[PDB]
Design a protein around this nucleic acid. Sequence first.
RNA 1: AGAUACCGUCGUAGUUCCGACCAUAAACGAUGCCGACCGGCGAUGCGGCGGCGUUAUUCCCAUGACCCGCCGGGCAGCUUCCGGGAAACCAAAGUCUUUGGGUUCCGGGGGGAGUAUGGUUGCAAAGCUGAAACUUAAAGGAAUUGACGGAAGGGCACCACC
Lengths: 217, 98, 221, 129, 25, 83, 132, 71
Amino acid sequence: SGALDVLQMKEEDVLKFLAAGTHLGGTNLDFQMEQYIYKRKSDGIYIINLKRTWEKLLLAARAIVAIENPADVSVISSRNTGQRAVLKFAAATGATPIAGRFTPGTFTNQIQAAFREPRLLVVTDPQADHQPLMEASYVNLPTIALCNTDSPLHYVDIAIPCNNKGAHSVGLMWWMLAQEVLRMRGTISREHPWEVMPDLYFYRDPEEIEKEEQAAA
Amino acid sequence: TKKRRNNGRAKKGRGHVQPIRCTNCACCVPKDKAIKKFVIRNIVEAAAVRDISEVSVFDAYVLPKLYVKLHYCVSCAIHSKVVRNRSREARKDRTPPP
Amino acid sequence: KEWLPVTKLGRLVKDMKIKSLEEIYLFSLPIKESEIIDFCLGAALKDEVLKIMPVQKQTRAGQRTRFKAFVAIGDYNGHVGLGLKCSKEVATAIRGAIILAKLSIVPVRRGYWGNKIGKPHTVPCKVTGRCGSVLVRLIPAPRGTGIVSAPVPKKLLLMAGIDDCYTSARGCTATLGNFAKATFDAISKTYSYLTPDLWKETVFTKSPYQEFTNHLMKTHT
Amino acid sequence: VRMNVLADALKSINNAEKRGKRQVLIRPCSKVIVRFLTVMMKHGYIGEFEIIDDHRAGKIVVNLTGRLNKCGVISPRFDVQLKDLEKWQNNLLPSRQFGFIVLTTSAGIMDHEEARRKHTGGKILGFFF
Amino acid sequence: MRAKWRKKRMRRLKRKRRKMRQRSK
Amino acid sequence: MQSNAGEFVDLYVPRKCSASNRIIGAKDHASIPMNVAEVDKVTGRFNGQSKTYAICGAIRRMGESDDSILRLAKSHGIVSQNF
Amino acid sequence: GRVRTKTVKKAARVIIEKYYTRLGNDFHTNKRVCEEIAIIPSKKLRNKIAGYVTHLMKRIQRGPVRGISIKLQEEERERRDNYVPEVSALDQEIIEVDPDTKEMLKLLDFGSLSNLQVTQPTVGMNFKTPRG
Amino acid sequence: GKCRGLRTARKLRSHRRDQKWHDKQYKKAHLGTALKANPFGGASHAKGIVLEKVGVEAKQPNSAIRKCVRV
RNA sequence: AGAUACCGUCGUAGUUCCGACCAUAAACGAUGCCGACCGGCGAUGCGGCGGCGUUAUUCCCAUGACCCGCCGGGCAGCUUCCGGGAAACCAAAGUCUUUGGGUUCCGGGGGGAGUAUGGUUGCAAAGCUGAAACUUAAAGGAAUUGACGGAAGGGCACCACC
């Protein structure tokens, strides 16, 4: 992951981050996230250092591939922005998706019908998905979280610094990390690019779904 | 039990402010303590602006405004329903209502 | 009669694949099945109802009297629990506080006063515990001292398998819930105290959720 | 004002340990601070510290482990005979198995266990366990 | 009984005691 | 935890946070032993051997749990020294 | 006050969820469906359930309902959610880039790309909302 | 304590001495007022002559007439 | 009902100034002072330092007005499982049975009582100092649930109204 040519950040991956805008962080800054920022712009935007983004992506991928049972890595998004991306990440990795409305006590209350008991949480936003983090406090659940410059690292146990706000940047980070866990499992080779398209994971405005349905004819 | 952290007033580094006389009563209220409104108001409400516009000598005359600053004691203010009792969590909201 | 485990950890315990709750407490795993402690320490577990306490809420018409039962549980050789259950009748309160105690059992680390020969007999270091106002201090004592204590913590420390101990309570100990909780908080903190015995850098053994990660996929849904 | 310099230093590394910091800056360097720290180091409670000479009272950076439960001062520096040293280690240390009471003797600043060996009492500085 | 008016009654009572003790001096 | 004879006498040796070196109680339910997968450096695939880092609840609610794992992986040769 | 109680709705949801394909839009046919596939002791309750069943069937014809699941779930969230365009919105010819984003790419290995248009910086450093 | 000086023994002692008069049990047993006022004059028992027999009303809630003696 | 009240019209002392007294207030942050350490964030006041750019002196300099940050001291604020506390709550009311940085004042159940008495200060009013006999099982603090309100808001009924 570090000082290795095989798992080093490639040239096409930088163009996928610059188009998506994963480097382009929020206006505000958390003190726990000063180490994952190159520099601040003029017009108060923080630029995330994509090398450190890439190392935290690999470390997360390691954490997920280490989990021998692929089923019990529960992958969570509340916000619409992630609900598609996390559901396609389940298809790829063989994870368990919870897309929208995380019922409190799904890790803590046994008698609930949707009582999941994972080994690892993956979280699209520590703020929006605060309730999964907090129930990870009550059952020994390490937590990977896609974090912004604004996001608090309360109960997040490895943070992937990103734009987790923008539609493209989320789906791309989920694509990147789905492709990385399947690479590191030895399912896919590394020389050729991946069959699954990074555009697949992007949430679309319900305006855009009926705009494509109009433009399909 | 200490109900309000600021003590219901707005002095932090004084130890004395000057008393204002409550407009409704004549009660002497610390300036910072007093509940203050700034009422801008048209000299005529709604029914009389219809009549003045027609009986004005002038060409589309903009009507003048009546600029009062009301100072209330806490008792007058609550009785006249300017301020109002709130829940212990909702007390802490310093945002003025829309 | 036949126990049916609903949690992941309970399923391992029933199938004799995690073989002592020492292994559960190594990974700080929340025990929520009652029959895990009934499985391992089942014969060496004894129950004493510390207090039946009637509590009341004032209603439109009279009081609604419910009964709060404090149950101290533990084998006289390593483990204690302390369960508190409030119910409308006394039998439901006692039974519920037996279950909550079993769930809540912790292991007590016990050490030596001076000479280190034979089995350990006392608390390994001075450890305070508290809730409310009640501050309880447990102090290592020599062999044969007994538990020099008020009758409530004396009853938990007997149940902890501690033979010898000096106590020193503070605040409103007359409130038993606080006093029983405070002395349980004091023996809770024995395996949460970093002595020089516990300096040898940690060898991380494999989790029971990893050791039997291939077994759990088929054994249940 | 600042009066007991050793007190400030010991509370400073105590507050740093409690938070879980890996190293701490203790602003005034005395001789008594260095001796106390060396005694804590020789029993493995802290890592290799280092003093920072500005042409004033120096500063010390101490590399903390997670071994130090508490590090305290006793003020004033009470004068302890060998007879009394048992009654200080009974009411100032958790166990008789571990923990130390550093006291300045004529021999030097050392733990109660070395004070017993050398048969030399002295003034109590503080303790650590 | 307000503690201020208690303090006022105890002052008047004292003030009558100082008035009645003076008439032997 | 020997006696005078040498017998290991306490009933379990508790884990200890890899970040702070502070032991992890039987009921610190916010603890996390995180397994980081290893790599055959020529291939870039999962070996089967993995590094195990434990963290106590206290650091996790303190918000320092990610930077602790970042240092532990960098201090294991997983993360680049550059970073 | 014609509000359906929990006994009507729960029954009507489970009847659609398990026997979707037997139902339609007509009240009177799925009245007789509810007769067969459920043992309802009342005639009035039978009608209530049949009635709300038909209402939920009209709602399902429009779009997916929050408190029920369809077998594929349902040719749009399953099949159409596998939508792929000709070329990705990522695959851009000219990617606009900040001068300071150019700097962190220069302190990366990627100091010189072909398809990055480094832009003029945002003059007039004014990016906050005024107070009060 | 509040003054932890090595040479504060007369401040620590004289303070305790002064504040010990706010203890009610101490002041009673260490003034001559409670003893000079005590009918028994600081004795366990005392003999006296019965002069009348009195019926004292019980404080209240429990209302009986307690047969005491004026001595 | 009375109304040596609240309401109203008058209205002396006083209210204002100078000179002397007086020395008390819910004189409050009901929180003594000095020192160290222990999260974060946005503000604001003062002084200094650096930085794209707008703007005035237009003729530029350098100063003002803004904007963006940094530092120190200040009144504060928000947030947080630092930690503390009976709790309300508190970045201090934390670093406390794992108890010791320095130091002053002061409390010891409720009453009696800030009374009596002596001293002292004052023109006086009164201030400071200040008990006891006797009496009593509680007085009190915080919080919870109810009940109640001549507090605020919402809902319902031809045993309410329209």
